[PDB]
């Protein structure tokens, strides 16, 4: 039908069959997977000890289904009769039901290549979105690819990154050639969150929530590059030197990630803007883009921090500390304190839901006289309509 769309005949011969597909096959897939979240997760790995083993064959078939339906949703939103919402809901559910350890540990090579091709095509799709949007600021193929990107590309990558992060599965999934695409997506999303346009004004939220999921999903501390070489899992160590020369790799972390700043630099602009106390409406980009990295970054790499493991110290992948926390989260607190008086906003609700586990992470002896000010300030600001928790 993509071929015959340019043809004069617009009467699709199997419209009945494609409507049966959309109305029946996809929703029954949805209900089955939603009734059975965990059966696919139960592969004798201890979840559902009563049984419910999902075979390895079943799981690569699930992965192939996911990849092929992603191929269907590629640039076909117009052909879909508004069912793209159902498409992306099934995208979610198959995302949560994915099992990356088992699928990568044992898998068929065509499914392997299909998943890698899917992630590469998604990455280059958002890349060409980047390129066209930034080269052209004048106002229908371009707007069609843009709204396709906003509607489908961001939610699917967000769902994949989220299930990866909340499982801690997917680290072995991102082992080779996934990381080049992941750096491309990182540079691209950072450029979206840095640039200003009516489009990014429309999706304030999407580009501020995708980065948080990407940080949690991604297993390499790109912020702390000083000890990144010394992580054995690093692709820099993996690629030897001959494979660098064969591939198109800059062989340097600073060369391959020049746009993203250092962790100390993010921290120092966070401190500067907190002490400045500017209104939310001069430069919302920072507390909607950098802050998700703070929350998600630190949430992901606590246990990978050297502090938790005195054994294997300074050869951990990151460098995290309770003193970092007492600095950065207090910085968040000062930001929310000084900006409660100006323009309020639901972005603080979004930050609260993101940082809900962070208060659990912080010790009770670190709650006292630190978060109690938050309680007394929130009840003192009864004049302000905003309430938290």
């Amino acid at each position: 039908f993509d071929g015959g769309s340019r043809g004069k005949g617009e009467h699709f011969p199997y419209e009945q069959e494609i409507k049966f597909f959309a109305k029946v096959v996809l929703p029954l897939i949805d209900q089955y997977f939603k009734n059975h979240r965990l059966y696919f997760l139960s592969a004798a790995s201890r979840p559902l000890c009563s049984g419910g083993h999902a075979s390895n064959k079943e799981k690569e078939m699930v992965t192939s289904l996911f990849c092929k339906l992603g191929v269907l949703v590629r640039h076909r939103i117009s052909l879909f009769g508004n069912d793209a919402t159902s498409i992306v809901n099934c995208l979610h559910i198959l995302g949560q039901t994915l099992d990356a350890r088992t699928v990568m540990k044992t898998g068929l090579e065509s499914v392997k290549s299909a998943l890698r091709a899917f992630l590469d095509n998604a990455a280059e799709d958002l890349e060409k979105t980047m390129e066209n949007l930034k080269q052209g600021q004048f106002t229908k193929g371009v707007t069609q690819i843009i709204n396709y990107t906003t509607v489908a590309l961001l939610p699917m990558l967000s769902s994949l990154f989220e299930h990866i992060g909340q499982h801690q599965f997917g680290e072995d999934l991102i082992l080779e050639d996934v990381q080049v695409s992941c750096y491309r997506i990182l540079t691209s999303l950072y450029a979206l969150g840095t640039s200003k346009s009516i489009y990014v004004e429309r999706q304030r939220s999407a580009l501020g929530e995708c980065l948080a999921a990407f940080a949690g999903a991604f297993p390499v501390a790109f912020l702390e590059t000083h000890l990144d070489k010394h992580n054995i899992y690093s692709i820099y160590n993996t690629k030897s030197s001959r494979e660098r020369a064969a591939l198109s790799l800059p062989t340097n972390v600073e060369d391959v990630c020049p746009n993203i700043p250092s962790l100390e630099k993010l921290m120092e602009e966070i401190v500067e803007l907190a002490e400045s106390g500017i209104r939310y409406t001069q430069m919302p980009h920072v507390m909607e883009v950098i802050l998700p990295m703070l929350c998600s970054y630190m949430s992901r790499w606590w246990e990978h921090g050297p502090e938790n493991n005195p054994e294997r110290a300074e050869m951990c992948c990151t460098a995290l500390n309770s003193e970092h926390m007492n600095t950065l989260l207090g910085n968040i607190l000062k930001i929310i304190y000084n900006n409660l008086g100006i323009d309020e906003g639901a972005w603080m609700k979004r930050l609260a839901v993101f940082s809900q586990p962070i208060i659990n992470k912080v010790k009770p002896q670190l709650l006292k006289t630190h978060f109690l000010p938050l309680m007394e300030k929130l009840k003192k600001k009864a004049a302000t309509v905003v309430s938290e928790e």
């Binding site: 004798a44 049984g51 083993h53 390895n56 044992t106």
Partner: protein, 337 residues
């Protein structure tokens, strides 16, 4: 006997068995056995150093039957029998060995470079099962001969400490025969005729055959200590982690019935993170070894609460009450299963 032996195996094993015998004589003479016409085991003297044809026919029989039981056991394990490639019989790499590692005669000690092939852990477990089976066969042979287990080795009384289960078997002997079997099955792999072993997956009912017919024992206080008013507390320490339930019981609880299965007990299952009263629901989390569960009953508000290491357990909702409302009845006493 019930398994049949395939044609590829039947015409390739003669070579496999002679290869295994050659490797056996080679690693023994390398670990230090020399040649001698006179037969002596303490003086490491082997009258059977000759080839399989000049080898004693009984020992050649032992070699054939050991490779039989090897491949037959491999098939019985569920091996997906299939042809891999004739490429290894086409091309094989013989190494050049220095005289120090060489033997006195001109035999080729290492026909194949054993190093480059690495054995999968799933494959490794099956070689462990092969060692288990061989040890059991030897043990039953000893039992047929009349040998029995003893703490001390004595041939006169036919006592052998080695007649123990392989898990209980001594580390040195078990690793020695384990590495010899490594070598045998691994050169079997190295001839390129690698049998396609089954994908090792574990899923089982997992030993419900517990000792005796008892599934649980219930410990309770005397019926005379039943409380009908006030606020009461006691602690329950879990030395281990497993199927244990703690809570409050009515004076009519039945010793043979599980706590909470009926209306006469209110219990908390920490093995499944469940609360039990006329059925099971989801409540709290699971304990570990050494965890202490505090049991709390309030008879004038008819409420029950539980703690794990001090913190109060929660229901599916935010409620802190394990059981919201119940009648006083004849009272309650501490109970644990």
């Amino acid at each position: 006997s019930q398994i049949v032996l395939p044609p590829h195996l039947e015409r390739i094993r003669e070579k496999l068995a002679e290869n295994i015998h050659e490797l056996w004589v080679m690693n023994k003479i390398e670990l230090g056995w020399q040649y001698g016409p006179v037969r002596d085991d303490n003086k490491r003297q082997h009258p059977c150093l000759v080839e399989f044809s000049k080898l004693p026919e009984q020992e050649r029989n032992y070699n054939l039957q050991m490779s039989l039981e090897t491949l037959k056991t491999l098939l019985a394990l569920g091996c997906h029998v299939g042809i891999s490639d004739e490429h290894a019989e086409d091309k094989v790499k013989k190494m050049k060995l220095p005289k120090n590692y060489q033997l006195t005669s001109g035999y080729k000690p290492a026909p194949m470079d054993l190093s480059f092939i690495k054995l999968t852990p799933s494959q490794e477990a099956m070689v462990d099962k092969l060692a288990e089976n061989a040890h059991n066969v030897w043990a039953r042979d000893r039992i047929r001969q009349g040998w029995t287990y003893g703490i001390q080795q004595d041939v006169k009384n036919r006592r052998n400490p080695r007649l123990v289960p392989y898990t209980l078997l001594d580390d040195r002997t078990k690793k020695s025969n384990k590495d010899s079997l490594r070598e045998a099955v691994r050169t079997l792999l190295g001839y390129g005729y690698n049998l396609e072993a089954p994908d090792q997956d574990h899923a089982a009912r997992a030993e419900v055959c517990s000792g005796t017919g008892e599934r649980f024992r219930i410990f309770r206080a005397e019926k005379t200590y039943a409380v009908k008013a006030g606020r009461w507390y006691f602690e329950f320490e879990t030395v281990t982690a497993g199927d244990m339930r703690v809570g409050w019981s009515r004076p009519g609880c039945q010793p043979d019935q599980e706590l909470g299965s009926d209306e006469r007990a209110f219990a908390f299952d920490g093995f499944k993170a469940q609360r039990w009263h006329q059925g099971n629901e989801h409540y709290g989390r699971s304990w570990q070894a050494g965890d202490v569960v505090g049991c709390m009953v309030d008879m004038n508000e008819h409420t029950m609460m539980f703690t794990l290491n001090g913190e109060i357990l929660l229901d599916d909702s935010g409620s802190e009450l394990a059981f919201k409302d119940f009648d006083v009845g004849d009272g309650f006493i501490p109970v644990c299963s």
